[PDB]
Design a protein around this ligand. Structure first.
Ligand SMILES: *[C@@H]1O[C@H](CO)[C@@H](O[C@@H]2O[C@H](CO)[C@@H](O)[C@H](O)[C@H]2NC(C)=O)[C@H](O)[C@H]1NC(C)=O
Ligand SMILES: *[C@@H]1O[C@H](CO)[C@@H](O[C@@H]2O[C@H](CO)[C@@H](O)[C@H](O)[C@H]2NC(C)=O)[C@H](O)[C@H]1NC(C)=O
Ligand SMILES: *[C@@H]1O[C@H](CO)[C@@H](O[C@@H]2O[C@H](CO)[C@@H](O)[C@H](O)[C@H]2NC(C)=O)[C@H](O)[C@H]1NC(C)=O
Ligand SMILES: *[C@@H]1O[C@H](CO)[C@@H](O[C@@H]2O[C@H](CO)[C@@H](O)[C@H](O)[C@H]2NC(C)=O)[C@H](O)[C@H]1NC(C)=O
Ligand SMILES: *[C@@H]1O[C@H](CO)[C@@H](O[C@@H]2O[C@H](CO)[C@@H](O)[C@H](O)[C@H]2NC(C)=O)[C@H](O)[C@H]1NC(C)=O
Ligand SMILES: *[C@@H]1O[C@H](CO)[C@@H](O[C@@H]2O[C@H](CO)[C@@H](O)[C@H](O)[C@H]2NC(C)=O)[C@H](O)[C@H]1NC(C)=O
Ligand SMILES: CC(=O)N[C@@H]1[C@@H](O)[C@H](O)[C@@H](CO)O[C@H]1O
Ligand SMILES: *[C@@H]1O[C@H](CO)[C@@H](O)[C@H](O)[C@H]1NC(C)=O
Ligand SMILES: *[C@@H]1O[C@H](CO)[C@@H](O)[C@H](O)[C@H]1NC(C)=O
Ligand SMILES: *[C@@H]1O[C@H](CO)[C@@H](O)[C@H](O)[C@H]1NC(C)=O
Ligand SMILES: *[C@@H]1O[C@H](CO)[C@@H](O)[C@H](O)[C@H]1NC(C)=O
Ligand SMILES: *[C@@H]1O[C@H](CO)[C@@H](O)[C@H](O)[C@H]1NC(C)=O
Lengths: 266, 360, 49, 122, 146, 49
């Protein structure tokens, strides 16, 4: 059950540079005061990443998923709720669905009949200062399901936080030999629209052995007002980083070997 | 024997290296708990019938077959793909569990590659069946004195359908060439007839509840399978540990390192395992293999005498009897008498110590 | 622990043929360096004497 | 054996067929091990009668304080070679063992005193 | 049978394998340590005449090193077996209308056994964890199978 | 003498690899030692002259 959001203006893919964001823990191993090099899928430093402008402004387009993906979200109030990953997205084959609502981060794995416009309904804004899930307008049927997962109950604030983006949410997705990975991290920031300059680490969240093939992914009934959102989409390719661990197991600095000759020498 | 001669010269000889053999082997794994309720299926209030046998999803649980098999309430138990004992180790991507009740005389139709009414009309099996067929008598529970007419079976079907094909067609069957119309008429037969189970019925006529655990192999990550175990932890003696597949030999000692909550292992610049975290009770431990070192034989000439002494290269002699004493930085020497007068070096040992043949 | 013994030796024949090949390189390097040190040590002996 | 097939019975069996490689290596590493002691034997022990300096330091206006050993330190080392020992920057699982040298680091410093005490008075 | 396979010593003779190699009666002639065309030029220390009957589609495990019911329980070829294996279809000579139940095989046994081991024991195998006594009982199955 | 031309081709190959590696090590051992005497021979010439 879905309703198309056709009152959408096409926006050019405006470009912005991700300075030093997207570095995470590739493997669950602790090593102290050493410089370990790794060859996996990572987001390049200072790379031209697509910056999306969301207000009016909510385009929900299909994007290809190849060699992993990146996500960053300079957000207030967590308008971002999840993503999907699959190869057909038309109930023919199993596809991944990640839904984060006010109660649980639920994982459902079925041959989802993915409708063109996936979105979740919330109590509009008439006069009442209340916000919670109303519409499951993401898919229609889930016939042959294989994997499900629900975290422990918690309540997340759906209140319409205003102002500059205070909470930084950066999420990384990959698929290796059927295993599905999601990584996350929360940190404060004070800046207007762009990504800050600085170094940070992204912690692992949960590993899921789904084993389905993925090639493309996607992030009264007409007319809605959305809070100002600035999220980004990056793509990952096999690259070599020089990760500097401290004696505590927390990353302090990283260098992309493939950026410039100075990086190659380092 | 090493020098391949009956006469050995004055000097120090390195032969027959030494290693402290580990005492025994220890196994450690995390906690295993999530059991899906086979109880509510096996002890279920009412089972489905053979005409519309139900299929139910078994997901993300432990398939502990020990309690499943050791129960004596079952009548027959036949696995056709693997040995019944070893289902607990080979993990299954998915398991198809069906519960159905038939006559005792029809149980030989359940076996694959057989001829029978329920083998051909509703429940057919492929020529490469792999699951396990389990049945148990339930006369005293299913039977009714007036006839328990709840169960139904396919008396007539238009054709023999494929294995594991479930259908709900109940239209009046056409036995003859003339078409059938209405509910009754010539060549008009009801495709469903009702089972009647009575206490007076003997073996073969009794109601027998049957369950089959069939499974599909390696088209998705493993989801449901049997249990696993671990033993008590020990310290201060080199043993063969197994932490989530981390086979190795070494002494177990409490350490001062501090992991992150999700961190599991430890590695050095040498890229080797150095610290492991217990998956049951969170602690940080060191791994250092128990001591090893070459054995050195110190002797004068064969003609002069026969007495010798043995040295352990870099080995502590607090643990020497595994194979007069004196401790040196190069190792611990036994069989020699220590003195204090200082002479010229006769045969070198290491760390400034030199042995000699002297007075008797 | 994964393959039967009919061909489990075939896999480990590679490591035996392999790990020896690595050990031969390390030892041969040491001989070259050891001969190089002698030139310095014998020269230093002349300086002292 | 320990490096190639550590703590495995079957691996230690197939290595037997390759003959005397294992014996060949152990002699080769031993050959350089004994040789190293011969070098430090040759360069430092040119004197066999160990002289010691007189306590008086009336050496005609020179002072050899930086080179004469300092009794204060736990090891009888002088001012200069304490700098050197601080400048330089420096048992294992898989059979790799390090053997101690025959001459302990304090023993060498005793020779150099004799080589230095003899040449400043004789 | 595969549990009672017969062994007969042959020595101090001259062996004519030429007829064996040129005979057309053999459906299977595959040697492992020798090639059959050079065999008449070789001399043997001893002859091991092992003989038995098995299913027609039961011959794969006869190869040295294999695994399964037969090579696990009742007949073995050593990993370094040297010799030749010979077979030929014998339905008319070893099959009967009523069933040749006269031959058994080791369906069950405790563990893996050493090569060329012979056993005719009929002690009931304790497949189940519960102790079994007497000669019958649930999950109490005799090792032989017809 | 025991096998025909087809499978004899396989066994003989691994003997040559085994024996050739044995001959390679001996030659590289001689070269290192032969260099040492060259240093001793030169020293004798200096003392003699
Ligand atoms: C929402 O929009 C999508 C397209 O954006 C619609 O999908 C179309 O469906 C019709 C018939 O159902 C097809 O003829 C078109 O080819 C489809 N378009 C594409 C791009 O595949 C969908 O039907 C719409 N649904 C609703 C409820 O409005
Ligand atoms: C958020 O999504 C989860 C996942 O669907 C919802 O959890 C379901 O809750 C209902 C009733 O609360 C249960 O009957 C379902 O069994 C739950 N799903 C699962 C998979 O267990 C949750 O209710 C949602 N929260 C909100 C506020 O909509
Ligand atoms: C998951 O279930 C669906 C539906 O139960 C399966 O789709 C069926 O596939 C069979 C043959 O593969 C067809 O005969 C049916 O017509 C299909 N049903 C529908 C509604 O289209 C699907 O195959 C199952 N997944 C797997 C991996 O077997
Ligand atoms: C490694 O982590 C420890 C523990 O978090 C750090 O020690 C803390 O240091 C801060 C500031 O230096 C103090 O306020 C805390 O009280 C310390 N806690 C403990 C338990 O010692 C340590 O500083 C970290 N390593 C580095 C290099 O900073
Ligand atoms: C050989 O092992 C013994 C015991 O394992 C060592 O003796 C210990 O030395 C430490 C350091 O002073 C003490 O704290 C312990 O109490 C001692 N234990 C015993 C039982 O004496 C000894 O130092 C080791 N020798 C070498 C050369 O490593
Ligand atoms: C010998 O000469 C040296 C250097 O010329 C003198 O060394 C210093 O002497 C002063 C005077 O007492 C001390 O304060 C310094 O600490 C000495 N240097 C060092 C590095 O300790 C030394 O005093 C002279 N000795 C005599 C007897 O004249
Ligand atoms: C598989 C399983 O748990 N079956 C249970 C058994 O454990 C229990 O003892 C019995 C009576 O409570 O009911 C059934
Ligand atoms: C990013 O955008 C700028 C300007 O739009 C362009 O010059 C640059 O090439 C882009 N990045 C890459 C990697 O091409
Ligand atoms: C707010 O909610 C109440 C009850 O939930 C409802 O009666 C009221 O109409 C809502 N406010 C508006 C402006 O509709
Ligand atoms: C997913 O699709 C690709 C497309 O070629 C296919 O190769 C792969 O086998 C599919 N995955 C599964 C699990 O069938
Ligand atoms: C060893 O001792 C014997 C006397 O028992 C003597 O004849 C012989 O010469 C000695 N060996 C050497 C090498 O001097
Ligand atoms: C040698 O000297 C030590 C001094 O540390 C003394 O304890 C020991 O008794 C002496 N040896 C003998 C044999 O007296």
């Amino acid at each position: 059950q879905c309703v198309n959001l056709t009152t959408r203006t096409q926006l050019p893919s405006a470009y912005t540079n991700s300075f030093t964001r997207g570095v995470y823990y590739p493997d669950k191993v602790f090593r102290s005061s050493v410089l370990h090099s790794t060859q996996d899928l990572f987001l390049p430093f200072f790379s031209n990443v697509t910056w999306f402008h969301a207000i009016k402004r909510f385009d929900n387009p299909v994007l290809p998923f190849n060699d992993g993906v990146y996500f960053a979200s300079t957000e207030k109030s967590n308008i971002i709720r999840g993503w999907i990953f699959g190869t057909t997205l038309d109930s023919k084959t199993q596809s991944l669905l990640i839904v984060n609502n006010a109660t649980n981060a639920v994982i459902k794995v079925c041959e989802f009949q993915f409708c063109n416009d996936p979105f979740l309904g919330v109590y509009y804004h008439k006069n009442n200062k209340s916000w919670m899930e109303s519409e499951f307008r993401v898919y229609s049927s889930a016939n042959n399901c294989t994997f499900e997962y629900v975290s422990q109950p918690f309540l997340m604030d759906l209140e319409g936080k205003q102002g500059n983006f205070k909470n930084l949410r950066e999420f990384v997705f990959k698929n290796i030999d059927g295993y599905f990975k999601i990584y996350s991290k929360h940190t404060p920031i004070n800046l207007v629209r762009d990504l800050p300059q600085g170094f940070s680490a992204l912690e692992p969240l949960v590993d899921l052995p789904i084993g389905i093939n993925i090639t493309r992914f996607q992030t009264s009934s007409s007319g809605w007002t959305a809070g100002a959102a600035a999220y980004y989409v990056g793509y990952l390719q096999p690259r070599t980083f020089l990760l500097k661990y401290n004696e505590n197991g927390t990353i302090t600095d990283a260098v992309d070997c493939a950026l410039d000759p100075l990086s190659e020498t380092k | 024997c090493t020098l391949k001669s009956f006469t050995v010269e004055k000097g120090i000889y390195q032969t027959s290296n030494f290693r402290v053999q580990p005492t025994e082997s220890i196994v450690r794994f995390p906690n295993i708990t999530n059991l899906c309720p086979f109880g509510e299926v096996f002890n279920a209030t009412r089972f489905a019938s053979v005409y519309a046998w139900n299929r139910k999803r078994i997901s993300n649980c432990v398939a502990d077959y020990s309690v499943l098999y050791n129960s004596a309430s079952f009548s027959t138990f036949k696995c056709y793909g693997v040995s019944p004992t070893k289902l607990n180790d080979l993990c299954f991507t998915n398991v198809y569990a069906d519960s159905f009740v038939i006559r005792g005389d029809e149980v030989r139709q359940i076996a694959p590659g057989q001829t029978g009414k329920i083998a051909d009309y509703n429940y057919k099996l492929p020529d490469d069946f792999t699951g396990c067929v389990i049945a148990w008598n339930s006369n005293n529970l299913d039977s009714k004195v007036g006839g328990n007419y709840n169960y139904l079976y396919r008396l007539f079907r238009k054709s023999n359908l494929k294995p594991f094909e479930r259908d709900i067609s109940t239209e009046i069957y056409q036995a003859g060439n003339t078409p059938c119309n209405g509910v009754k008429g010539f060549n008009c037969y009801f495709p469903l007839q009702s089972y009647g189970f009575q206490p007076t019925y003997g073996v073969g006529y009794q109601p027998y509840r049957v369950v089959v655990l069939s499974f599909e192999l390696l088209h998705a990550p493993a989801t449901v399978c049997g249990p696993k175990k671990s033993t008590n932890l020990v310290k201060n003696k080199c043993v063969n540990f197994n932490f989530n597949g981390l086979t190795g030999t070494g002494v177990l000692t409490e350490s001062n390192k501090k992991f992150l909550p999700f961190q599991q292992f430890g590695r050095d610049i040498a890229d080797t395992t150095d610290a492991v975290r217990d998956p049951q009770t969170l602690e940080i431990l060191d791994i250092t293999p128990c001591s090893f070192g070459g054995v050195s034989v110190i002797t004068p000439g064969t003609n002069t005498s026969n007495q010798v002494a043995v040295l352990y290269q870099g080995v502590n002699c607090t643990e020497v009897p595994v194979a007069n004493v004196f401790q040196t930085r190069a190792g611990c020497l036994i069989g020699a008498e220590h003195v204090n007068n200082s002479y010229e070096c006769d045969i070198p040992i290491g760390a400034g110590i030199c042995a000699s043949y002297q007075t008797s | 622990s994964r393959l039967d013994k009919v061909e489990a030796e075939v896999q480990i024949d590679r490591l035996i043929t392999g790990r020896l090949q690595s050990l031969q390189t390390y030892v041969t390097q040491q001989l070259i360096r050891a001969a190089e040190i002698r030139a310095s040590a014998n020269l230093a002996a002349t300086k002292m004497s | 054996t320990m490096y190639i097939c550590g703590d495995s019975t079957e691996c230690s069996n197939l290595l037997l067929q390759y003959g005397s490689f294992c014996t060949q290596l152990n002699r080769a590493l031993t050959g350089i091990a004994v040789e190293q002691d011969k070098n430090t034997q040759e360069v430092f022990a040119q004197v066999k009668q160990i002289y010691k300096t007189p306590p008086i330091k009336d050496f005609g206006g020179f002072n050899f304080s930086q080179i004469l050993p300092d009794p204060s330190k736990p090891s009888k080392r002088s001012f200069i070679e304490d700098l050197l020992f601080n400048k330089v920057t420096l048992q294992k699982f898989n059979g790799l063992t390090v053997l101690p040298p025959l001459l302990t680091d304090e023993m060498i410093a005793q020779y150099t005193s004799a080589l230095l005490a003899g040449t400043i008075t004789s």
